[PDB]
Design an enzyme around this catalytic site. Structure first.
Site, mmCIF file in Angstrom:
data_model
loop_
_atom_site.group_PDB
_atom_site.id
_atom_site.type_symbol
_atom_site.label_atom_id
_atom_site.label_comp_id
_atom_site.label_asym_id
_atom_site.label_seq_id
_atom_site.Cartn_x
_atom_site.Cartn_y
_atom_site.Cartn_z
ATOM 1 N N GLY A 342 0.843 -1.173 0.000
ATOM 2 C CA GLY A 342 0.000 0.000 0.000
ATOM 3 C C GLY A 342 0.876 1.220 0.000
ATOM 4 N N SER A 366 -3.956 0.808 -1.746
ATOM 5 C CA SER A 366 -3.757 -0.175 -0.713
ATOM 6 C C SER A 366 -3.483 -1.445 -1.426
ATOM 7 N N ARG A 367 -2.570 -2.262 -0.870
ATOM 8 C CA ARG A 367 -2.223 -3.533 -1.437
ATOM 9 C C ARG A 367 -2.312 -4.517 -0.315
ATOM 10 N N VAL A 368 -3.232 -4.242 0.644
ATOM 11 C CA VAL A 368 -3.575 -5.135 1.725
ATOM 12 C C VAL A 368 -5.085 -5.105 1.806
#
Lengths: 499, 50, 56, 62
Positions: A342, A366-368
């Site tokens: 993120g 966001s990468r979660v």
């Protein structure tokens, strides 16, 4: 009085020493004492000079060990015994750092008291494995609707905060701690986030304001403020996030949760540049060491949401990187961007446009994701993302004559933009996050004038509390939005729009 | 309060130059001899204890 | 009290409307308004007399 | 040993005595008692006022 102090001071030099392995300075220049001796010497071992300064020994050269001074050269002089402390850098870990502003060594610079500590644990500790980790379900709430919904954050997660300084870079960070006060009240210690603020290269005058602000909002009692100031030496700065992380591991290990906010790792990088250049180790791109990447990776991968194997606890992290143009191209940003999951991309244009602190949330990612989002908050804020998405594109025709669809988007979008404005140090409960986004989604904000959005907000919330703080309490406690509750909520909002 | 605190610091600095004076007293006397002798026998005591 | 005075005054702005003038409705309103706001802050400026002559 | 000797002599034989109260007084804000809360006089005196209200007001017209 002066005597009571004398007795303490003499007591503090009572009990004779008994030296062992020493080294002797041959020549001391540029914080690089070059010592003859120290035959046995652990790597990253602390050595204490006869000038009393402490050091680490990054170059272990074959017949001389090139100590790096953690302080001023004046103190050091030629032919100086350099006693070997015989302990790798370690810092106290324990609950005694709670409500304490400490220097890197662990000495309270606030002087609020000695650290209650169950261990002193070494600064760099290897990352927890694949199987020690577990999926992040727990969200962390900042009390800022946009951050909590648009950029949903959890606990264990490491996510960037790349933006320009003094736009309340510190303010954005501080807001989370305050909403976490609410959670802190909540008995469970996965809800007691014992926050750690790592102030890197920050003057004591500024940090004095920070400390006071934390105390003002009564949050400095589960806080830890690790302080490595602007003037504080580059070894301290370099190891300051590492040592700080080790404190974090103690909370995580205990199954508790905590949040460590490194501000700014860019100055941690700079300190390493000073060290490396002086150790003659080649400086990498932009004269910033190439294995600064290696450092960042070690530090940031200790942040983890553990599994029940190692107890489900966590160490949320939020590194802050300072940019001077938003130059993500720059070597230090590129590296950090890769490591983090993120990004929050805070932007100047928004600041001028009155969103202070200012975030460009089109360029935040966001990468979660929403796995670390409340189910309730997720439900009533999918819509919001899409309306805003259209709003960005349709802001590029906003400046006249426009199709009704485009114009409609603008009406909802302008109201939403005004609603998403926020001023420093205002956290807002989840039971009040959920209603506000619902209104915008249902386009109920459209009717109430842009100027009247401000008036709408406070009134709407009080009106909701009066009409049904039972409903609000249901949102909080159930944590889910039953169709009947949203039905009622829709009616309530309509009624509120009416008056 | 401010001047009282300042006076307390000033007292420490006044006594600091007195510490220097007392150091000079050690280095002149045959305390210079007697206490060096004490260090010698102390060093013997430690070093035999090794 | 003082707020009652002004509340009656604004009723009187629309009563003075029912006749001519309000040129001394404004002279009355301004006088009561000024001293009400000033005295409210004067009274908030006031801190009881005494300091910790025991602490210090 | 050396610590004990240095301490014993130093502490025992050195105990400062403060400066004059006058000198202390010089470096501080002393205090003197404020007087007068303000005394104004009764507003818009006499029957000048009484006549003024009666005469001045007739502020109605066609």
């Amino acid at each position: 009085e002066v005597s009571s102090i004398l007795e303490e001071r003499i007591k503090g030099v009572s009990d004779e020493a008994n030296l062992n392995e020493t080294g002797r300075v041959l020549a001391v220049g540029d914080g690089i004492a070059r010592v003859f001796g120290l035959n046995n010497i652990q790597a990253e071992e602390l050595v204490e000079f006869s000038s009393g300064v402490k050091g680490m020994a990054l170059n272990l050269e074959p017949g001389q060990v090139g100590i790096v001074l953690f302080g001023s050269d004046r103190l050091v002089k030629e032919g100086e015994l350099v006693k070997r402390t015989g302990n790798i850098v370690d810092v106290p870990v324990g609950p005694g750092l709670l409500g304490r502003v400490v220097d890197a060594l662990g000495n309270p610079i606030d002087g609020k008291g000695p650290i209650d500590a169950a261990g002193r644990s070494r600064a760099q500790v290897k990352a927890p494995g694949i199987l020690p980790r577990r999926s992040v379900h727990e969200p962390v709430q900042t009390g800022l609707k946009a951050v909590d919904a648009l950029v949903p954050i959890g606990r264990g997660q490491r996510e960037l905060i790349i933006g320009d300084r003094q736009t309340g870079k510190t303010a954005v960070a501080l807001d989370t701690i305050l909403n976490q006060k609410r959670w802190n009240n909540g008995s469970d210690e996965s809800k007691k986030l014992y926050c750690v603020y790592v102030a890197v290269g920050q003057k004591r005058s500024t940090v004095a304001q920070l400390v006071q602000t934390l105390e003002q909002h009564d949050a400095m009692k589960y806080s830890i403020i690790v302080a490595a100031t602007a003037s504080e030496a580059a070894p301290l700065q370099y190891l300051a996030p590492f040592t700080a992380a080790s404190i974090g591991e103690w909370f995580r290990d205990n199954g508790k949760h905590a949040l460590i906010v490194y501000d700014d790792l860019s100055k941690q990088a700079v300190a390493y540049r000073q060290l490396s250049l002086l150790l003659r180790r080649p400086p990498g791109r932009e004269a910033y060491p190439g294995d600064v990447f290696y450092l960042h990776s070690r530090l940031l991968e200790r942040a983890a949401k553990l599994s029940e194997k190692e107890g489900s606890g966590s160490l949320t992290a939020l590194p802050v990187i300072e940019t001077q143009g938003g130059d993500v191209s720059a070597y230090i940003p590129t590296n950090v961007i890769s490591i983090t999951d993120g990004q929050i991309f805070l932007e100047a244009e928004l600041f001028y446009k009155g969103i202070r602190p200012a975030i460009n949330v089109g360029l935040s990612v966001s990468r979660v994701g929403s796995a670390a989002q409340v189910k309730a908050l997720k439900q009533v804020a999918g819509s919001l993302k899409l309306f805003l998405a259209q709003y960005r594109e349709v802001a590029a025709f906003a400046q006249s004559d426009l199709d009704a669809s485009t114009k409609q988007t603008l009406v909802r979008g302008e109201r939403l933009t005004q609603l998403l404005k926020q001023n420093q140090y205002s956290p807002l409960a989840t039971e009040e996050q959920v209603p506000l986004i619902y209104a915008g989604v249902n386009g109920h904000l459209d009717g109430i004038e842009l100027s009247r959005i401000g008036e709408f907000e406070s009134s709407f919330l009080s009106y909701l509390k009066s009409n049904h703080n039972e409903l609000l309490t249901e949102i909080r406690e159930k944590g889910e939005l039953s169709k009947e509750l949203l039905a009622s909520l829709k009616s309530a909002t309509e009624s509120f729009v009416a008056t | 309060v401010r001047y009282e605190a300042s006076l307390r610091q000033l007292e420490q600095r006044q006594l600091a130059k007195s510490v220097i004076s007392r150091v000079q007293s050690e280095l002149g006397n045959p305390k210079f001899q007697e206490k060096v002798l004490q260090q010698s026998i102390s060093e013997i005591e430690q070093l035999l204890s090794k | 009290a003082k707020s009652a005075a002004n509340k009656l005054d604004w009723a009187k702005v629309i009563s003075s409307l029912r006749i001519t003038g309000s040129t001394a409705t404004q002279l009355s309103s301004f006088k009561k308004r000024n001293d009400e706001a000033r005295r409210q802050l004067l009274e908030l400026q006031s801190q009881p007399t005494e300091v910790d002559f025991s602490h210090y | 040993n050396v610590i004990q000797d240095l301490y014993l002599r130093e502490l025992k034989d050195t105990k400062l005595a403060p400066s004059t109260l006058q000198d202390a007084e010089g470096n501080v804000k002393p205090w003197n008692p404020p007087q007068k809360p303000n005394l104004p006089e009764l507003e818009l005196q006499g029957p000048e006022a009484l006549k003024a209200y009666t005469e001045q007001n007739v502020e109605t017209a066609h």
